[PDB]
Amino acid sequence: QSQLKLLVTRGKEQGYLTYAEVNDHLPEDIVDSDQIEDIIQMINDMGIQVMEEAPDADDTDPVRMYMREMGTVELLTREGEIDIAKRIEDGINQVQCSVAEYPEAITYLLEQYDRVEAEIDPELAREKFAELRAQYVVTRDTIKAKGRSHATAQEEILKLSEVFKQFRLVPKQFDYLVNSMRVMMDRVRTQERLIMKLCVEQCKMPKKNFITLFTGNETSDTWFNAAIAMNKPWSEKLHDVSEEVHRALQKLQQIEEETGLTIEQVKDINRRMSIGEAKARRAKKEMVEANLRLVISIAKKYTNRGLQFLDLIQEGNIGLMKAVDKFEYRRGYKFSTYATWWIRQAITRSIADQARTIRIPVHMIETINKLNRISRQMLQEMGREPTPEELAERMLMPEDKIRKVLKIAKEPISMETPIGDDEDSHLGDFIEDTTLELPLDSATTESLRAATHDVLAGLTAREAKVLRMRFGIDMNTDYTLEEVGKQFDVTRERIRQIEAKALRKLRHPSRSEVLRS
């Protein structure tokens, strides 16, 4: 109503397009560089109808909208933080324990250790890895012996799990193992989803029967042949897929032999692993979300140094994101300061490099700042400007080093900079081209080709070819006295003789003489 009626009735047509009028008669936060173009566009060009397109289209900022979602405080106390960190450690532990349940994780680590020894105390490595290998070989024998029907035998298995939990593995190792287990489970559900896709859809076996039947062994053909011998309408179609299901079962049995585990529980342990992953990941996400304030508050001090506010706080977020990863609640030191250092390091190690167009190493950045911080005193503790010789004298570096250092400073300047302020000047418009050659120069070069091509005409074959082949012209690759002397029987001195005689011939013609200059 207000905006539409005022705009239309007033603009009829405001004669000289009185822009400075209605922009004051508009609500919301003013002095913007966004709402501007939406008014200069409508008024003219497509008049009349455009003024009817404007209302129907009317019927903002990164940082300000960033603070909006961050506005969701959800701050924590010492109790809160410890609680979250406790859930983190809880999730992580359940994951590692789930890794311990996996016997192929132990035997692989064993195999890789033998690799390590086949080429941090070396004896301490031999010590613990032996302890693991010992508990493994004793636990392994109590499997097929079946003594203590997986009751006390299970005790040795879980004790072996504890022994494995003693090892402090490297981030790349744990990720490789867990990834390998999920890839293993991928192949598992690959076979299960294959058997299901083949029997349920292609053979018209209802999902009810498939879940009632397959869920049993999932490996032996006892369920499959019982499904075929069930004499149902969907059992006759199974004959057309017998080889496929057989192949899937044989491959799944193969996996049983690879893991050495009951197929009816691999899902369970892998499940609990996924459970722990979600828990630990979740808690860590809440952590970084909660201490989000700290990022901006400290990043504010590093602002304006070749990188904008958003980029800084983003590097501070990943700095906080790394901090949360390396921290435990069982630690007297609080998170408020520990995270702060990681954030400072995160953004400062970003402003160092990804700031100026040209590359630069960290030591360069530090030396440069040190030079400035020292220079600001020399002119204030004396009275005159800081001479480069004396300024260098106050430093470990000689002087020429500092001179080259100042040749790396600044972005530097951009081409689009106005200079003479003509109509309109630009620095990059004065920049000449030197890689190109003068049309005169190109013309002379062609005339030079013609000159030489015509000069070697007034020579003999066993002399034209000699001069041509030696100085390598009109044949790309140039040859030497030997490679030419071999192709002309007589070697070295004889060919150099002719080579010098050709030069003797060119002591009268004026063509190449003037071409010289």
Added chain:
Amino acid sequence: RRRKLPATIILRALNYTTEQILDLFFEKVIFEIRDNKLQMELVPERLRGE
């Protein structure tokens, strides 16, 4: 040189109530209600062009 605002907003910003604002630009006119009727403080000069 920004968007327009009623020039009385700055007055309120100077801690001026609405009543004080009115008593800084205009001349008041008092009416009395006595003997069940309405009287008025008449000023002859003010009745110019009415």
